[PDB]
Amino acid sequence: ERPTFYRQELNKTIWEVPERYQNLSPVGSGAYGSVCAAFDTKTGLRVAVKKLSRPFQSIIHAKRTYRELRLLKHMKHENVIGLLDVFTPARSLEEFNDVYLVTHLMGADLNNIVKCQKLTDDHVQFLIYQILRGLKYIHSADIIHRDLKPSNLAVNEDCELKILDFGLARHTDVATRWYRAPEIMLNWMHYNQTVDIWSVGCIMAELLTGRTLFPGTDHIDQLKLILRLVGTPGAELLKKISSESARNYIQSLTQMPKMNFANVFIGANPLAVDLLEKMLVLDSDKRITAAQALAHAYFAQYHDPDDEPVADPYDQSFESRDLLIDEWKSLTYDEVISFVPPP
Numbered sequence: 297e298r299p300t301f302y303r304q305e306l307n308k309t310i311w312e313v314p315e316r317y318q319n320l321s322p323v324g325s326g327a328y329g330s331v332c333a334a335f336d337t338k339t340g341l342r343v344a345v346k347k348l349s350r351p352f353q354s355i356i357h358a359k360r361t362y363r364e365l366r367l368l369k370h371m372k373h374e375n376v377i378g379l380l381d382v383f384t385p386a387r388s389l390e391e392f393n394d395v396y397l398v399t400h401l402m403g404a405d406l407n408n409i410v411k412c413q414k415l416t417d418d419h420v421q422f423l424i425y426q427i428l429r430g431l432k433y434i435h436s437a438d439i440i441h442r443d444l445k446p447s448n449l450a451v452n453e454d455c456e457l458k459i460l461d462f463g464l465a466r467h468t469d470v471a472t473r474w475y476r477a478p479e480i481m482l483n484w485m486h487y488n489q490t491v492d493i494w495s496v497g498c499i500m501a502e503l504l505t506g507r508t509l510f511p512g513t514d515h516i517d518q519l520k521l522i523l524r525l526v527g528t529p530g531a532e533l534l535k536k537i538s539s540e541s542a543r544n545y546i547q548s549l550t551q552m553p554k555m556n557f558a559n560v561f562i563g564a565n566p567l568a569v570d571l572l573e574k575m576l577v578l579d580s581d582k583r584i585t586a587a588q589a590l591a592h593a594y595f596a597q598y599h600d601p602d603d604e605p606v607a608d609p610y611d612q613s614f615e616s617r618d619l620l621i622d623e624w625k626s627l628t629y630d631e632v633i634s635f636v637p638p639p
């Protein structure tokens with residue numbers, strides 16, 4: 297049966313949600329869209345409801361909406377945000393103009409944690425572990441995050457973590473680059489899933505040291521900052537950059553050796569430093585994977601091959617179809633009423 301909705305103004309718009317969701321309350325962030333913390337009396341969980349902004353204003357948004365929804369309904373892992381529900385006040389396609397999403401709530405993100413807790417070695421392991429485990433899931437479904445960062449890691453009171461914003465296209469017109477992998481920033485050859493490991497590395501290094509590893513100002517400064525630690529590229533990596541300008545420009549810079557991670561991260565679990573040198577490598581191909589990373593002896597106290605699941609193949613076949621603004625809209629509708637809540 298169709299539930300009974302109610303109305304109220306939150307974040308300057310009409311919010312019409314089913315009565316199971318009570319005590320809606322804005323998060324204060326805004327960086328994640330329009331989102332409220334709520335209590336779901338159906339599951340009895342604390343949830344996070346997000347009202348999609350004019351989801352179908354144009355092909356770009358239309359397809360973007362269906363894309364996110366597809367991703368959310370497909371992902372079912374304890375370290376990745378997933379769909380507890382999705383609903384619309386509309387009774388028929390005709391109406392349909394808004395999409396509402398629901399997920400578990402955490403209330404905070406990594407970014408807003410270095411400024412608080414002092415972070416012991418132990419908690420760092422737990423946090424990096426969850427990112428790698430969730431990453432392994434995501435990667436198995438052939439989905440790349442591409443822009444992983446501390447602000448995309450939703451963490452709750454008990455340092456439990458969920459990865460957010462995965463697989464969402466690119467940017468329009470900017471974007472922080474303090475964690476993006478160099479392969480991406482200078483746009484080189486085909487780039488594998490390992491781009492995310494580069495990011496995990498930056499984060500891990502940040503959690504260990506309390507300061508941002510590569511807080512560059514603009515594009516060349518970032519590259520300056522990274523090459524000063526991992527060193528400039530040899531002929532092996534240069535030859536693989538099946539690019540042009542980027543290759544000729546990269547090699548223009550002054551050659552530099554890789555620093556000694558051991559003395560860069562003064563005082564830090566040695567096993568931690570070992571992992572960083574395996575993640576922060578210029579060459580993605582020679583960079584460690586999430587699965588490999590979960591076996592490293594640093595995560596000794598948490599590793600458990602049986603409890604580190606994989607995803608089913610993600611049917612990404614819609615990413616090539618050219619559709620009308622109304623068709624992308626309709627598919628998002630189909631995806632909404634065919635939805636089935638998890639157990």
Ligand SMILES: Cc1ccc(C(=O)NC2CC2)cc1-c1ccc2c(-c3ccccc3C)nncc2c1
Nearest residue numbers: 323328344346400401402403404405450460461462
């Ligand atoms: C609702 C929603 C829908 C979809 C996706 C998403 O990543 N979609 C991409 C396609 C994958 C993300 C969210 C999202 C945003 C902020 C959340 C906060 C939260 C609350 C306050 C301050 C900071 C945070 C992080 N706490 N718990 C869960 C949260 C979930």
